[PDB]
Amino acid sequence: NLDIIGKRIEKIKQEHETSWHYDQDHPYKTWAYHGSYETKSSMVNGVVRLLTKPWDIIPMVTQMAMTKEKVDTRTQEPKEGTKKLMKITAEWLWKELGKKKTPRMCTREEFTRKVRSNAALGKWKSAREAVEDSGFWELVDKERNLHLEGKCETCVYNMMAIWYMWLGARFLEFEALGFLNEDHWFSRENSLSGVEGEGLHKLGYILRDVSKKEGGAMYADDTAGWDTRITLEDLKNEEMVTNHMEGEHKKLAEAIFKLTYQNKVVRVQRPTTVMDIISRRDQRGSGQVVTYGLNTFTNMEAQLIRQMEGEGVFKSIQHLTVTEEIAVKNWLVRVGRERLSRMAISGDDCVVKPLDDRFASALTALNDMGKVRKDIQQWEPSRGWNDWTQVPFCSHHFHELIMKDGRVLVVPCRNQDELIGRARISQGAGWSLRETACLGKSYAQMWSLMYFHRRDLRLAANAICSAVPSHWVPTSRTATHEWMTTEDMLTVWNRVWIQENPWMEDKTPVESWEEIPYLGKREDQWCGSLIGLTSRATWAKNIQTAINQVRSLIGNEEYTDYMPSMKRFRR
């Protein structure tokens, strides 16, 4: 414990020896308190807002732009029967994920490029500058050699609930564990339940394939605060990925797991403004990308065990008999792969089509692993879905949409207020008119690619692309983002929905936007369309005037009129 975290703790004190204090009114019960010292929002995208005027009076849109507790909780230790189930399943799952993959270290050369290309990776101002400074790498080397020693000095978390770390520590995590993401361990092809790198244009088709299997309802239970419910028992089954490694990699990964994952150290600001230094062994404390993969892994494990429980593979979680152990092992070997194919899992989010509806009341292992369901009483059976087009997954639902030529699109969808409200927000300071416009164009092209079937979004997308210089490149400060390009959007649509779509047998390209269908007028309204409203009609008829207002603000640039791509706006 204190041997592992002390050096980190001791070092911080020294740098604040003048302002150190062991305050006795510290709000922590579950976290460990060590000492303190002295220290001390969303903007609106005007391009998108000026081109979505009817939404200026919709509170669901406008409120999205205005504006820890659950981190201080503790999950009890699972029973010995649960721990056995988890260890057997995790051992078998790492082996399956490893069959066609080789663990390997990621490199400085890999890390530098990602940073020189902008990406989330929690002396030098920007991190781009540090990656160019040898001094930094001298620091990294120092820490690396310390990790090989089984010790840690500078790998400390900063709460705000995302925990940032110094770039060097992010590198050491990426060096040891980046392979999980960089080499697509949680791809569908590889992991069977996973959907990493799939894209929102494929999730619908994947849920439809799971629906084709014989079984009961589709279950999509959320977990209440998943990250907070990760047990030390979970952080150790995740560690068993090191079993598949060798050489320096195994030691570096064992150190990431041992030191920065199974014994965290965090500096939290408390206005009461001091910087508390607290610690704890459990919960999820890693980079957002390694968090995704280890969330997917532990979720896959939990859902296979809930499936085992519904099939009566084991009678009770209190203790596993020797014959039960063998029975669990034989199940995994005989049907594990089939059972993984019955699930779509994205980090803490899942959809399971079990063998039958006994799964709905198989709750003892799930509750005892601490994966308590959100908004339903602990022992109340899960509500299942009878139609794959109603199932929630990754903040979306999916429609089946028949083109005028008979070909079948499976399209992603969500409440339109949520889509418009997110596009009206830009996170960052010092944004020029030009980069605000290019962010608006990134939303517009995403809408043309993913949400073309929504009347308001195809119209607003065409208006924004008409209002922003044709050659300005779409930007995003931080899945498959095919909308991030200056290529013609009809050409990308044909590539994503027809040519590269493995569920479309006939590869006949689409020649214009009017060949591409919409949802039913009533379905469109149900998912939040303003069609029918006087406000939306004035907006559509006078769109050229809104486009011209934004063109006048940006100035005398080369624009294209994309409005005649629609039927109505043709002369």
Ligand X SMILES: CN(C[C@H]1CCOC1)c1ncncc1Cl
Binding residues for ligand X (CB under 6 A): 455, 521, 531-532, 537
**Sequential DSSP letters for 381-446:** PPPPBS-TTT--BTTBEEEEEE-TTS-EEEEEE--HHHHHHHHTEE--SS--HHHHHHHHHHHHHH
CB of 533 to ligand X, least distance (A): 8
Which of residues 156 and 459 has its CB atom nearest to ligand X in the complex?
Answer: 459
CB of 160 to Zn ion, least distance (A): 21
Helix (H) or strand (E) holding 290: helix 288-310
Q: Would the annotation count 263 as a binding residue?
A: no
CB of 153 to Zn ion, least distance (A): 6
Beta sheet of 274-280, edge-to-edge order = 32-35, 274-280, 264-270, 157-158
Q: Would the annotation count 222 as a binding residue?
A: yes
Residue 563 neighbours by CB under 8 Å, 6+ apart: 462, 463, 466, 543, 544, 547, 569
Query: Pick from Zn ion, ligand X, none: which does 532 bind, CB < 5 to 8 A by kind?
Result: ligand X
Query: Pick from Zn ion, ligand X, none: which does 413 bind, CB < 5 to 8 A by kind?
Result: Zn ion
Which of residues 240 and 531 has its CB atom nearest to ligand X in the complex?
Answer: 531
**Cα maximum dimension of the chain:** 78
| Three-class secondary structure of residue 267 per DSSP | strand
DSSP structure class, residue 36: B
User: Is position 413 an interface residue for Zn ion (rule: CB under 5 A)?
Assistant: yes
379 torsion bin: left (phi>0), alpha (psi -120 to 50), beta (else)? alpha
CB of 176 to Zn ion, least distance (A): 11
Kindly identify the residues of this chain, within the stretch 123-152, that bind Zn ion according to CB under 5 A. Answer: 143, 152
Helix (H) or strand (E) holding 264: strand 264-270
User: Is position 543 an interface residue for Zn ion (rule: CB under 5 A)?
Assistant: no
CB of 55 to ligand X, least distance (A): 16
User: Is position 266 an interface residue for Zn ion (rule: CB under 5 A)?
Assistant: no
Query: Pick from ligand X, Zn ion, none: which does 455 bind, CB < 5 to 8 A by kind?
Result: ligand X
Query: Pick from ligand X, Zn ion, none: which does 521 bind, CB < 5 to 8 A by kind?
Result: ligand X
Please say whether the beta carbons of 452 and 565 come within 8 A: no
Helix (H) or strand (E) holding 457: helix 455-467
β-partners of residue 267 are: 158, 277
Which of residues 476 and 525 has its CB atom nearest to Zn ion in the complex?
Answer: 525
* Residue least distant from ligand X (Cβ): 532
Q: Which two tokens stand for residue 170?
A: 């992010």
* Separation of alpha carbons 174 and 153, rounded Å: 18
Which of residues 203 and 413 has its CB atom nearest to Zn ion in the complex?
Answer: 413
Which of residues 239 and 301 has its CB atom nearest to Zn ion in the complex?
Answer: 239
Query: Pick from Zn ion, ligand X, none: which does 119 bind, CB < 5 to 8 A by kind?
Result: none
Q: Would the annotation count 226 as a binding residue?
A: yes
Site string for Zn ion, 505-534 (x = CB under 5 A): ----------------------x-------
CA-atom Rg of the chain in angstroms: 26
CB of 454 to Zn ion, least distance (A): 8
Which of residues 331 and 452 has its CB atom nearest to ligand X in the complex?
Answer: 452
Residue 320 neighbours by CB under 8 Å, 6+ apart: 80, 81, 84, 85, 314, 328
Residue 275 neighbours by CB under 8 Å, 6+ apart: 16, 36, 37, 38, 39, 267, 268, 269
Which of residues 245 and 527 has its CB atom nearest to Zn ion in the complex?
Answer: 527
CB of 58 to ligand X, least distance (A): 17
CB of 151 to Zn ion, least distance (A): 8
Distance, CA of 353 to chain centre: 22
Please say whether the beta carbons of 163 and 269 come within 8 A: no
**Sequential DSSP letters for 310-363:** HTTS-S-SS---HHHHHHHHHHHHHHHHHHHTTEEEETTEEEE--SSGGGGG--
Which of residues 441 and 453 has its CB atom nearest to ligand X in the complex?
Answer: 453
Query: Pick from Zn ion, ligand X, none: which does 155 bind, CB < 5 to 8 A by kind?
Result: Zn ion
DSSP structure class, residue 551: H
Please say whether the beta carbons of 85 and 316 come within 8 A: no
Query: Pick from ligand X, Zn ion, none: which does 371 bind, CB < 5 to 8 A by kind?
Result: none
Q: Would the annotation count 18 as a binding residue?
A: no
* Separation of alpha carbons 183 and 104, rounded Å: 9
User: Is position 156 an interface residue for Zn ion (rule: CB under 5 A)?
Assistant: no
Q: Would the annotation count 349 as a binding residue?
A: yes
Which of residues 52 and 299 has its CB atom nearest to ligand X in the complex?
Answer: 52
CB of 527 to Zn ion, least distance (A): 3
Q: Would the annotation count 413 as a binding residue?
A: yes
Which of residues 29 and 567 has its CB atom nearest to ligand X in the complex?
Answer: 567
Binding-site sequence positions for Mg(2+):
222-223, 348-349
Binding-site sequence positions for Zn(2+):
143, 147, 152, 155, 397, 399, 413, 527
Binding-site sequence positions:
143, 147, 152, 155, 222-223, 225-227, 295, 348-349, 374, 397, 399, 413, 527
Binding-site sequence positions for CTP:
225-227, 295, 374
Write out the residues near Zn ion by the rule CB under 5 A. 143, 152, 155, 413, 527
